[model samples]
Target: KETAAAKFERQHMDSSSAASSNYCNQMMKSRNLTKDRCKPVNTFVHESLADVQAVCSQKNVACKNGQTNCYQSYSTMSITDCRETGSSKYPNCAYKTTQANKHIIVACEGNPYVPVHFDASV
Candidate 1:
């Protein structure tokens, strides 16, 4: 059984090697992000889980879904955006990968206050 935090980690965290051109195609499948429905756009952060968790205490921000529990990171972090290509369809999802450095925003929850949802980047 996977906790929400654990699922979030699997879906969003990728602290290891920098993303290759086909990183999204491989990672989205391996990490189980492209299951029943393909996520049109997703991001993988290239920072340690601890560093991302620390953002929970940094600065509060409003999430796009109107949640006030979201936090924005102070420093820019390396990240990769995986967007589904136009010709791609569910279960056969293909993505285009883009690497960038930006301040990340995530929504936190639970007692230990870990990031449970990725909000956006700026």
Candidate 2:
């Protein structure tokens, strides 16, 4: 079975041209970002998976849903976000691309160390 951590990687860990221009259209379909409904927004981290997994031990960072255990990276990370364009009305979902470098906040869970969820970039 695919774990949540692995899911996160498949969904968010692209470090190449996947983050380049025309990325949204290609990735949305290839990565199965959504089907029946449009995914309003999502972020992909362009860094080594291990480099991102260690943020769990940092001092507290708030979550997108207002929870704790989210950690902010001390170093900037590369990322690209896809936000569905307003005119995008379901069947033909279109997205606007925005790329940036920022410290990321990821939600961590389980064991002494564990899997993380993409919360946001700071």
- Cα TM-score per model: 0.95, 0.86
Clashing pairs in 1: none
Task: Return the lDDT, model 1, position 71.
Answer: 98
Quantify how close model 2 is to the true structure by its C-alpha RMSD in Å. 2.0
Per-residue CA lDDT of model 1 for 20-108, tens digit only, reads 89899999999988888888999999999899999999989999999799999999999999999999998899999999999999999
Candidate 1 off by > 4 Å = none
Which consecutive 10 residues in model 1 have the weakest lDDT in total? 14-23
Using lDDT as the measure, which candidate wins? 1
Alpha-carbon error at 109 in model 1, in Å?
Answer: 0.8
Best by TM-score: 1
